[PDB]
Subunit: 60 residues, 4 copies
């Protein structure tokens, strides 16, 4: 999107707390989370978790 932090296919991980890592497969927006992403785990195919942008970091 002309503005999003990440794009479909970006490989990301959660920065802290419970772990999660995999590819960006989607997106969501609410008043509480105005920029959120859906992420399919690379260890467990098919399982997707949603998180706010702040919780995620791209993997370099």
């Amino acid at each position: 999107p002309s503005n999003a932090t990440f794009g479909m296919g970006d490989r990301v991980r959660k920065k802290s707390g419970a772990a999660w890592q995999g590819q960006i497969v989607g997106w969501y927006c609410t008043n509480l989370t105005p920029e959120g992403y859906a992420v399919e785990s690379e260890a467990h195919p098919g399982s997707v978790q949603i998180y706010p942008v702040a919780a995620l970091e791209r993997i370099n």
Copy 2:
């Protein structure tokens, strides 16, 4: 999207099993769920659940 069953803001509910109802706030796609939606509950603001298109119906 030039093709999606639902659009942001559509009011939907789960057709069966565990209940869920509210507005479409997002979208996701995986091999397992090639057309999925994120839905923020209208009863519990801020809480979003993700589901495959098949599980949802627009509320008329």
Copy 3:
């Protein structure tokens, strides 16, 4: 349990952020969340969310 903050059937709600309210239906424990509860929403029968004890408050 001879020690738990809440019991099955306790009516609770999330204290802040995304909302959630309903009855305690279960329990879990990990290193990250050594005291956690499963809660079935009272607005959406059948839908359960899990949270750490800290996030919940009994409803008086």
Copy 4:
């Protein structure tokens, strides 16, 4: 429990669809899922998902 299919610490996996594998860390019961388990992924420490007994199999 004098009756449960699995016990805390059992190593299990989801039988089909989205994958999930790890240890049993908890339990829940609703009318919809009268026997459910919380499972912490062994690939993503700290992340727990809940499922009905039917969806899981112990790993031998």
